């Protein structure tokens, strides 16, 4: 697979600046993966130290956002839940 | 124990409360005569598996106690003229459960702490905050009057 980043300007309604850049190429196969090497398979890859692996999970996973207003309190149970009940690193 | 503790802390029986928590934890925590340590060191024991229901658990109480005891330690140390021991407990008050009326108090109070140390500007902010998150804004306007005498800002004092 060849890998192509396209860029258009939004300020300009002429679209004067359609640059592109072929930013490289990714070869892959079953023999690459037969030996892992690119997979992420879970918990053994708990200690996350090649940042590629974190960003893979930030693209591939289903992102859902939330506003939380507790209006007759303030809101610190989050840190406990996060660090305690869920045991976040 | 949380309950026993709620009573005795309504009753100012903190020597015995400490004592109970010391036998509760290791009695190795026997030198550690601060409460605010023991209350934290106390672990409510289980996730409280499928039992008869309750209305409230050790955690949800433990959490009322830390905030309550800390709040009381704070006003004690302020009036008794240690507006440096105070600020530790009055920020332990805003942190862990602090219902907003509990906060407006924490904030008027730190307005005094800093007025007493001679920090009129640090005080003023905590007082403006107490205003907004205020449903209860007599005591801040009072702390402002006492601040505007202390600077002598007389028109401001009378207005507050």
Curated annotation (Swiss-Prot), chain A:
Signal peptide: none annotated. It is found in: Nucleus. It comes from the Eukaryota. It is linked to Fanconi anemia complementation group B: A disorder affecting all bone marrow elements and resulting in anemia, leukopenia and thrombopenia. It is associated with cardiac, renal and limb malformations, dermal pigmentary changes, and a predisposition to the development of malignancies. At the cellular level it is associated with hypersensitivity to DNA-damaging agents, chromosomal instability (increased chromosome breakage) and defective DNA repair. Some severe FANCB cases manifest features of VACTERL syndrome with hydrocephalus. DNA repair protein required for FANCD2 ubiquitination. Belongs to the multisubunit FA complex composed of FANCA, FANCB, FANCC, FANCE, FANCF, FANCG, FANCL/PHF9 and FANCM. The complex is not found in FA patients. This is Fanconi anemia group B protein. It comes from Homo sapiens (Human). The chain holds residues 595 to 683 of 859 of the full protein.
From Swiss-Prot, chain B:
TPR repeats lie at residues 104-137. The lineage of its organism: Eukaryota, Metazoa, Chordata, Craniata, Vertebrata. Highly expressed in testis and thymus. Found in lymphoblasts. It is linked to Fanconi anemia complementation group G: A disorder affecting all bone marrow elements and resulting in anemia, leukopenia and thrombopenia. It is associated with cardiac, renal and limb malformations, dermal pigmentary changes, and a predisposition to the development of malignancies. At the cellular level it is associated with hypersensitivity to DNA-damaging agents, chromosomal instability (increased chromosome breakage) and defective DNA repair. The chain holds residues 143 to 302 of 622 of the full protein. This is Fanconi anemia group G protein. It comes from Homo sapiens (Human). It is found in: Nucleus; Cytoplasm. The gene is FANCG. Belongs to the multisubunit FA complex composed of FANCA, FANCB, FANCC, FANCE, FANCF, FANCG, FANCL/PHF9 and FANCM. The complex is not found in FA patients. In complex with FANCF, FANCA and FANCL, but not with FANCC, nor FANCE, interacts with HES1; this interaction may be essential for the stability and nuclear localization of FA core complex proteins. The complex with FANCC and FANCG may also include EIF2AK2 and HSP70. It comes from the Eukaryota. Signal peptide: none annotated. DNA repair protein that may operate in a postreplication repair or a cell cycle checkpoint function. May be implicated in interstrand DNA cross-link repair and in the maintenance of normal chromosome stability. Candidate tumor suppressor gene.
């Amino acid at each position: 697979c060849t890998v192509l980043l396209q860029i258009m300007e939004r300020e300009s309604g002429n679209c004067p600046k359609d640059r592109y850049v072929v930013c490289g190429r990714v070869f892959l196969s079953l023999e690459d993966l037969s030996t892992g090497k690119y997979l992420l398979t879970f918990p053994k890859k708990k200690p996350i130290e090649h940042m590629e692996d974190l960003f893979a999970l930030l693209a591939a996973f289903h992102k859902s956002c939330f506003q939380i207003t507790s209006p007759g309190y303030a809101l610190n149970s989050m840190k406990v839940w996060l660090l305690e009940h869920m045991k976040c690193e | 124990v949380g309950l026993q503790a709620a009573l005795w802390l309504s009753a100012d029986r903190l020597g015995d409360l400490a004592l109970l928590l010391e036998t509760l934890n290791g009695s190795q925590s026997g030198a550690s005569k601060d409460l605010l340590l023991l209350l934290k060191t106390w672990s409510p024991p289980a996730e409280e598996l499928d039992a008869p229901l309750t209305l409230q658990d050790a955690q949800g109480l433990k959490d009322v106690l830390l905030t309550a005891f800390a709040y009381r330690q704070g006003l004690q140390e302020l009036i008794t003229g240690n507006p440096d021991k105070a600020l530790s407990s009055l920020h332990e008050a805003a942190s862990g459960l602090c219902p907003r009326p509990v906060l407006v108090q924490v904030y008027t109070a730190l307005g005094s702490c800093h007025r007493k140390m001679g920090n009129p500007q640090r005080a003023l902010l905590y007082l403006v905050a107490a205003l907004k998150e205020g449903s209860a804004w007599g005591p801040p306007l009072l702390e402002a009057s006492r601040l505007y005498q202390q600077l002598g800002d007389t028109t401001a004092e009378l207005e507050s």
